[PDB]
Design a protein around this ligand. Structure first.
Ligand SMILES: NC(=O)Nc1sc(-c2ccc(F)cc2)cc1C(N)=O
Ligand SMILES: [Ca+2]
Length: 261
């Protein structure tokens, strides 16, 4: 396990941004003053803290234009804090819901290509993200003004999927791949991408949102098909990604090629 150790003296904790899986998220400063995000892990069992370090270790060996940077881990008393990139306009799901009306199809396709390019890179390195969702897509540039285009960053997955409870995996439906509800393959990120595409198509509203945890579980148990976008070309892709059999999902090379044409 390889990650930088950040001394508590080098960080300043600012305002609460919200909550992640077993975390409290804050804006912060990192003395080098760099604007950062601090993911403070709740007091937890060693297994959860080990899964949290494993994410920081995974994020430290990769580099990509559309992957949010991890500066390291800070231990402040009994708290584990991952120090991460501050991305200006924040999570995409929140932005899309707040942003009046819908964004253009062309804007949505750029975000989709950028995310597919990041996942293509992890696929080639044989590395699992395991938490692909609108909440984990961060908006660096709005790209709404003439001549401009959006710029996203896929954030770290947080506490690894292997350490979470069945309740947390259920809360993760429909982003969570169905084989993960009861192995850790890159196939799971093709499902997460497919569910993120729908979530973006539906302006930050994810399918099965209003449903209860037993309804979500039953939906995957009865292997019901997720909704499709109106565009037949996009419909083919999202249904191909959102295939229950993981070996039938397309590679990110194919997904990226399909998205560009
Ligand atoms: N690197 C990284 O993940 N940065 C994050 S996470 C986050 C957030 C997380 C959970 C919430 F409930 C609300 C906001 C914001 C930002 C940011 N602005 O960069
Ligand atoms: Ca909107």
């Amino acid at each position: 396990l390889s990650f930088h150790r950040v001394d508590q003296k080098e960080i300043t904790q600012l305002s609460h941004l919200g909550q992640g899986t077993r975390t409290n998220v804050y804006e912060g400063r990192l003395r080098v003053e760099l604007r950062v995000v601090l993911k403070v892990l709740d007091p937890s069992h060693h297994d959860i803290a080990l899964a949290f370090y494993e994410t920081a270790s995974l994020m430290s060996q990769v580099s990509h234009t559309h992957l949010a940077f991890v500066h390291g881990v800070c231990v402040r008393g009994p708290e584990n804090i991952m120090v991460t990139e501050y991305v200006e306009h924040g999570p995409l799901d929140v932005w899309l819901r707040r942003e009046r009306g819908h964004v253009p199809m062309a804007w949505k396709m750029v975000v989709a290509q950028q995310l597919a390019s990041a996942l293509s890179y992890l696929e080639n390195k044989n590395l699992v993200h395991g938490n692909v969702c609108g909440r984990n897509i961060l908006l660096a540039r709005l790209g709404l003004a003439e001549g401009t285009s959006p710029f996203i960053k896929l954030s770290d997955p947080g506490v690894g999927l292997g350490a979470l409870s069945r309740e947390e995996r259920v809360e993760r439906i429909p982003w969570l791949a169905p084989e993960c509800l009861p192995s850790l393959s890159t196939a799971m990120d093709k499902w997460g991408f497919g569910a993120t595409l729908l979530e973006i198509c539906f302006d930050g509203e994810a399918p099965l949102q209003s449903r209860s945890p037993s309804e979500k579980e039953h939906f995957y148990q009865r292997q019901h098909r997720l909704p499709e976008p109106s565009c037949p070309q996009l419909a083919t892709l999202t249904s191909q990604c959102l295939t229950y059999e993981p070996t039938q999902r397309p590679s990110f090379r194919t997904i990226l090629r399909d998205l560009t044409r």
